[PDB]
């Protein structure tokens, strides 16, 4: 009998990428200036965002069902591996059916194909269960004779984060790659001078990537001290990942969404809201785990623990900064863009010096 | 001190996706019929293919250096995690510099940025080494006082395979999603009738996905019996993955490459060549491991072992079928397309029945 760890890792990667794909249409929404005040186009954009959210949630539900199934199964086999590949294929077919239904919501074809795909997933998983139970040695020892699998959650989250960070660089690679017919005209053939138009732009990439990379760093930190992953924690993680997938929306440059008519205040508000939603659910995961620390958290991060305050600050850094920037957009709009840039530059430094800042604050409050 | 396994998994995912991204420009090659006989466009397409190969190899070299580094380090830390994030950011910046150099190969800007990025990677890794050695408890026990890390190779391969399988479905989602203004004209508003143009197309997806999914299944099988991963095996795996990344080229539909002028024989030959190159290097990995079976392979797959013939057949199935199809394109061109479709339908069945076919063949040869 074979060890199923790599097969489950492959499934996690596939499903995470599949869930995150549907943000691409959102980033490719073109709004002409003539349609800036057209409510129909704005409604279409909102509908496409809702479609992305629904598809992410559906793929996550399928992934959770798969996780249940292969917690029940445990071991794998050639036949089981091929059946898992068939299940992954059927699941990956879901975005196509959902897109077809979106294009023609009033025709039965989309609903019919979606139902057929769901039934196919069900039948494939039932076949997997039947094969596993027909050979008892392929079952988990407890079954051979609820909690979530932490590694599956971590792999799914890593896939989502990596895909977002990749979409950023794909956007950059197209933003600032001029052609000879463009450089010879805009800059009289001096490519170096094109830095004046491209220098800052790719520099902005460094700011965006960090925002994702540090968010993962928070997640990576939290689950280093997580013992038991509860279903509520899984749901909160799913919401956090769903809102993480929208970071390219607030950070991409070539994206049609980025080229829509807008103002600085609106863009800053949207980016701050997306970051706040992404991070507040990680903070909610941590708070939820704190209620049952005895069974969900390592002793170091329990109340009064050595790592407690550090973890709390690490997870609350982004929500507080995002909320402060959003408030500044309303109270100090004239300098809100500068404050947002300052936040982008400072939050990584705060993460780097976090262990010193926390101790300094603790000592200052103790003496005072 | 923290466990570095998840950080390395995240790095593997990032680097694998980054390596595979550069196939997207290749799939977006638009060749008008007026330029079918224009040698310049064909040369440009070949140059972009070579650029994709070079970028994949460079990203793989960076990933291998990172693997060496964090085999030396072993344990991780908050500062080490942030430094690893910085290193990943610098590495992800490589595609942008390579693309800029490609656009203007005769200007120093591209080479200058590429050199700056490489030096940045070097300095970041040197800082990681210095920090790790300044705190001896963050070093591996042997160092605290060559072989490859199998899990890193497996994670990188899984990332590449998942990205290819995802690119397939992204192509499909755009191939066969008509709009009302298109359905009302081409099919008089009968969306169901559009199956006549869309039915087979997404059906073809099922054929393409399997081809990737089974290739992974072969890889997944081989490394289940691999003890020690040698550097030569790593190089062969890198070549196999590089040629796997070109599967969307031979299987995508909307891709401008797919819409280029062509003939059935040429497309079949290209697809067969790509599949053959992808699988022959897995077979080469297996053969290379066989030379040092005592140190690289589990006893079950040694010469004369129970699983030996099964593994050999599993890894040689695709190369033989691809070579036979390619030969048919020259000897039986009139039926080569049908033979290719038959191969696409049959190879999964051969994989499913492999354990029976191998035994049947062995018995038949023994009695005869
Ligand atoms: K994993
Ligand atoms: K992944
Ligand atoms: K892994
Ligand atoms: K992956
Ligand atoms: K992509």
Residue numbers in the entry:
A (entry chain B), B (entry chain A): 30 to 174, 254 to 476
Provide excerpts from the study.
Transmembrane protein 175 (TMEM175) is a potassium (K+)-selective cation channel that is evolutionarily distinct from all other known ion channels. In mammals, TMEM175 is expressed in lysosomes, where it is critical for maintaining lysosomal homeostasis. A 2-fold symmetric ion conduction pathway runs along the center of the dimer, lined by two copies of TM1 and TM7, the first helices of each repeat.
The resolution of the putative open state improved from 2.64 to 2.45 Å and the closed state improved from 3.03 to 2.61 Å. In the closed state, the isoleucine constriction formed by Ile46 and Ile271 is too narrow to allow ion permeation. The side chains of Ile271 point toward the channel axis, narrowing the pore to a minimum radius of 0.2 Å. For the closed state, we can now model three ion-binding sites and 25 water molecules into non-protein densities. In the cytosolic region of the pore, where the channel undergoes minimal conformational changes during gating, the K1 and K2 ion-binding sites and water molecules occupy almost identical positions to those resolved in the open state. In contrast, there is little correspondence between the ion and water configurations at the isoleucine constriction or on the luminal side of the pore due to the conformational changes that occur to the channel during channel gating. The inward movement of Ile271 displaces the ion-binding sites on either side of the isoleucine constriction. Movements of Thr49 and Thr274, which both coordinate water molecules in the open state, result in a movement of the luminal K5 ion-binding site toward the luminal entrance of the pore. Thus, the higher-resolution structures reveal how changes in the protein structure alter the ion conduction pathway to prevent ion permeation in the closed state.
